[PDB]
Design a protein around this ligand. Structure first.
Ligand SMILES: [Cl-]
Ligand SMILES: [Cl-]
Ligand SMILES: [Cl-]
Ligand SMILES: [Cl-]
Ligand SMILES: [Cl-]
Ligand SMILES: [Cl-]
Ligand SMILES: [Cl-]
Ligand SMILES: [Cl-]
Ligand SMILES: [Cl-]
Ligand SMILES: [Cl-]
Ligand SMILES: [Cl-]
Ligand SMILES: [Cl-]
Ligand SMILES: [Cl-]
Ligand SMILES: [Cl-]
Ligand SMILES: [Cl-]
Ligand SMILES: [Cl-]
Ligand SMILES: [Cl-]
Ligand SMILES: [Cl-]
Ligand SMILES: [Cl-]
Ligand SMILES: [Cl-]
Ligand SMILES: [Cl-]
Ligand SMILES: [Cl-]
Ligand SMILES: [Cl-]
Ligand SMILES: [Cl-]
Ligand SMILES: [Cl-]
Ligand SMILES: [Cl-]
Ligand SMILES: [Cl-]
Ligand SMILES: [Cl-]
Ligand SMILES: [Cl-]
Ligand SMILES: [Cl-]
Ligand SMILES: [Cl-]
Ligand SMILES: [Cl-]
Ligand SMILES: [Cl-]
Ligand SMILES: [Cl-]
Ligand SMILES: [Cl-]
Ligand SMILES: [Cl-]
Ligand SMILES: [Cl-]
Ligand SMILES: [Cl-]
Ligand SMILES: [Cl-]
Ligand SMILES: [Cl-]
Ligand SMILES: [Cl-]
Ligand SMILES: [Cl-]
Ligand SMILES: [Cl-]
Ligand SMILES: [Cl-]
Ligand SMILES: [Mg+2]
Ligand SMILES: [Mg+2]
Ligand SMILES: [Mg+2]
Ligand SMILES: [Mg+2]
Ligand SMILES: [Mg+2]
Ligand SMILES: [Mg+2]
Ligand SMILES: [Mg+2]
Ligand SMILES: [Mg+2]
Ligand SMILES: [Mg+2]
Ligand SMILES: [Mg+2]
Ligand SMILES: [Mg+2]
Ligand SMILES: [Mg+2]
Ligand SMILES: [Mg+2]
Ligand SMILES: [Mg+2]
Ligand SMILES: [Mg+2]
Ligand SMILES: [Mg+2]
Ligand SMILES: [Mg+2]
Ligand SMILES: [Mg+2]
Ligand SMILES: [Mg+2]
Ligand SMILES: [Mg+2]
Ligand SMILES: [Mg+2]
Ligand SMILES: [Mg+2]
Ligand SMILES: [Mg+2]
Ligand SMILES: [Mg+2]
Ligand SMILES: [Mg+2]
Ligand SMILES: [Mg+2]
Ligand SMILES: [Mg+2]
Ligand SMILES: [Mg+2]
Ligand SMILES: [Mg+2]
Ligand SMILES: [Mg+2]
Ligand SMILES: [Mg+2]
Ligand SMILES: [Mg+2]
Ligand SMILES: [Mg+2]
Ligand SMILES: [Mg+2]
Ligand SMILES: [Mg+2]
Ligand SMILES: [Mg+2]
Ligand SMILES: [Mg+2]
Ligand SMILES: [Mg+2]
Ligand SMILES: [Mg+2]
Ligand SMILES: [Mg+2]
Lengths: 166, 166, 166, 166, 166, 166
């Protein structure tokens, strides 16, 4: 019946949503008419990370004596992702949406005088999110430099050099 | 536009649904007023397996030249799972529901003369499912023998002996 | 002459009090007419942890340029602890009492604009306390399930399975 | 209801008292305006030893079929310890006070024809105490030789050479 | 154009200033008419630490999407440092000046509702600074005890025993 | 009061200036809208080298019986560096400026009949500088060949192939 308790359930749902969107990006880049497998695997890894982030909120809820209450995991906003630049731009926005949600949870915890929840967020979530935003930003800058979307050689090269070989 | 292609997308959605239900069972058994941690971890492992099973269907779809099309992952049917017997009975039914879906996909593949899809299902899915159904059945029999739901000592003992220590 | 300085001295005293209560629980479970040695050793380990927590506050005080000022360590509230359920219920309440004291120190540090002290508490104390509260809660639930206090077989079994073998 | 049983409880209380005094000496020497860290760590180790000596009496009481009965642990006689010479002189007196208590327990055990308790004391306590008294005596002689309290160079040197480096 | 962004640039400049002052202290103690090489190396290590602390703020600025803007690194306040006591007293004041700047940045971040920056400071800066202040304080106390500035034997001994051998 | 002594102090200041400029180039290439991390790390390494070169002059001054006298470290000439070609061209000019200063010091040492200083410069500085000038020259030629500044694919490729992976 707690506002933080409900907020955490919402946050867990959002992490699950983010994981599913990344999974969609993985599937797209794996397609035979897309076929950027390093880019695919980058998004697969991000999907697994976000699911791990959801499971951490489940654990926190239970340690906190709250109840985990699950809702539908909504499908991603798109069925196809265009190319590496468009997908990275959507990822950036997704990470920012998750970041603002985290920051909103932190403001709630602050108002509710819940320093344990403030620390949890600061220690387990906020800096990972700053890192992911920076790295995706950096990728977008490079994709622009490489001439996306028009420059297919540049897109091919990004897949080889910018993302780890899978 | 393929019937097998759509069927595979449906199957992938069902695997994701099954994974989410298991995740719910994990969260429940982790609760401070439930507190059967081996049972919790058993269901967590099943959730991870079902997600892996979804990802295999994504890979198959793409290798097949189909398109992965995602839908909402519906929340589990219950928010709380009663006890170890009730949760295992629900797991049994979930596994049977997934099994019948797999078998229905197999009948479709058979009609569509798709031996590759028939083999995929037979080699990667059907026997795992027979194993999971047997093991859950066996657990139910033991939980009954142990006096569930009334016998809380028996439920405690099941957690110690029947499921691997986490 | 600082309010945080005095508060820290009080907190150190409380940690020492908590350690002593745990030591009493250890001694009780070691008795020849109690004789639950795993349960005894669980409480002995908690006593050593709380003493370590007191010593950390001494170190903090000194690094902070404050003065460690000691008071009497009051004897535990009880001379005998009933059984494993009663002892765990008292431990739960003790952990909650220490937790509220920590949280009160944190509110003081927050008012006094002492982020270093806020971090200390958040990084070294608050999450350990959430863990201990969860684990004791979980034990109480299990002890209830096992039929305590009446079910001596259940109490025997708890000692074997729930607490680490000493 | 035993005289030896009560005597042991008193002895355990005294060991706990001695440990707490040593802990106070540790805290003092750690202070930023005292800052003799080897001397601090020497007294910290003595505090841990005395606590171990208390726990041995708890074990003995329980093996003996007696009951451990705890009382308040009184705060040390001083809040500040002067310097290394004054602290060592107080330690010497504390060790002698504990030694006389042990010897008094031994006389009681002798009167009560309790050779097991006599052996316990002789084998686990009396010789450790002779060693500690000798070593502190030896330190006092050296601190005098070094010109304490006036000779701060001598006090600095004692910390470097006489007590183990921490 | 951010107040935190400018504040971080100022903080980075101050860290660079602190590093340069330490470098000056290193050079002084290396002189043939000063010749306290352990003391020299202590200040050299502190200079390298402060430069590392500046580079961390550059990294933070960039991850934060701000711009690193550099200003002149002002020369140290003194060209010569007297002796080990005077140098340590100046170091103490320098560390306190850096600490107050950090704490002021933290107050700004708090007002601007920037918990990520609050955590950064608390996790990477504030406790290191408490440690450095304590250790220098402790050194000053010892240098006083050793008879500085008049007691050149004491100063020689400090170099041998208090600071690590280089 | 020596001309070589003052000259060395000037030289040390210039090395510190050069290190700071390189640090600025590092920060620029790390930016989210620049994002050439290998190029960033190349300039970071050059900054650390130049600081090491300053510290060597401090050591030389002191061994020589001179006094290290520090001045302000002036901020770099630019706040932003354009792109990899512009930054390399500025680095080339910076290295040449340091080289001419070294050569001027050498002429002074030669006039002052200071073969030890001549050797120092020849053995520790002049050949490193010839190497750095060659390597930066070579980079400029390649950046031109790659089509800088207009060819962003070429700039991306330079970062991958020409500078070591960080
Ligand atoms: Cl709400
Ligand atoms: Cl709330
Ligand atoms: Cl939701
Ligand atoms: Cl995680
Ligand atoms: Cl779409
Ligand atoms: Cl954001
Ligand atoms: Cl890149
Ligand atoms: Cl269909
Ligand atoms: Cl078909
Ligand atoms: Cl579906
Ligand atoms: Cl699988
Ligand atoms: Cl329900
Ligand atoms: Cl079935
Ligand atoms: Cl079984
Ligand atoms: Cl107060
Ligand atoms: Cl205060
Ligand atoms: Cl108190
Ligand atoms: Cl601890
Ligand atoms: Cl009682
Ligand atoms: Cl609480
Ligand atoms: Cl349990
Ligand atoms: Cl008596
Ligand atoms: Cl007796
Ligand atoms: Cl007593
Ligand atoms: Cl012992
Ligand atoms: Cl006193
Ligand atoms: Cl004696
Ligand atoms: Cl001695
Ligand atoms: Cl400002
Ligand atoms: Cl701001
Ligand atoms: Cl500035
Ligand atoms: Cl650092
Ligand atoms: Cl001066
Ligand atoms: Cl300060
Ligand atoms: Cl010596
Ligand atoms: Cl020595
Ligand atoms: Cl010292
Ligand atoms: Cl000149
Ligand atoms: Cl000259
Ligand atoms: Cl100059
Ligand atoms: Cl060098
Ligand atoms: Cl500029
Ligand atoms: Cl040149
Ligand atoms: Cl090249
Ligand atoms: Mg909470
Ligand atoms: Mg919808
Ligand atoms: Mg939100
Ligand atoms: Mg606040
Ligand atoms: Mg962190
Ligand atoms: Mg991440
Ligand atoms: Mg993220
Ligand atoms: Mg096919
Ligand atoms: Mg619904
Ligand atoms: Mg079906
Ligand atoms: Mg067949
Ligand atoms: Mg098979
Ligand atoms: Mg299976
Ligand atoms: Mg299954
Ligand atoms: Mg403080
Ligand atoms: Mg009382
Ligand atoms: Mg309180
Ligand atoms: Mg933590
Ligand atoms: Mg704990
Ligand atoms: Mg605790
Ligand atoms: Mg006896
Ligand atoms: Mg009193
Ligand atoms: Mg006595
Ligand atoms: Mg003996
Ligand atoms: Mg001893
Ligand atoms: Mg002793
Ligand atoms: Mg930020
Ligand atoms: Mg000036
Ligand atoms: Mg300031
Ligand atoms: Mg905070
Ligand atoms: Mg920390
Ligand atoms: Mg430090
Ligand atoms: Mg510092
Ligand atoms: Mg010379
Ligand atoms: Mg200027
Ligand atoms: Mg010149
Ligand atoms: Mg010549
Ligand atoms: Mg050479
Ligand atoms: Mg070089
Ligand atoms: Mg160079």
């Amino acid at each position: 019946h707690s506002d933080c308790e409900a907020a955490v359930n919402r946050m867990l749902n959002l992490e699950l949503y983010a994981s599913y969107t990344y999974s969609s990006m993985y599937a797209f880049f794996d397609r035979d008419d897309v076929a950027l497998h390093n880019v695919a695997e980058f998004f697969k890894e991000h999907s697994h990370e976000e699911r791990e982030h959801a499971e951490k909120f489940m654990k926190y809820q239970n340690k906190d004596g709250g109840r985990v209450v699950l809702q539908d995991i909504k499908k991603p906003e798109r069925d196809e992702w265009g190319n590496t630049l468009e997908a990275m731009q959507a990822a950036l926005q997704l990470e920012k949406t998750v970041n603002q949600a985290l920051l909103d949870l932190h403001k709630l915890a602050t108002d509710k005088v819940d320093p344990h929840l403030c620390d949890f967020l600061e220690s387990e979530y906020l800096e990972e999110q700053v890192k992911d935003i920076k790295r995706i930003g950096d990728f977008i800058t490079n994709l622009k430099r490489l001439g996306l979307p028009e420059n297919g050689m540049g897109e091919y090269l990004f897949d080889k050099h910018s993302v780890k070989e899978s």
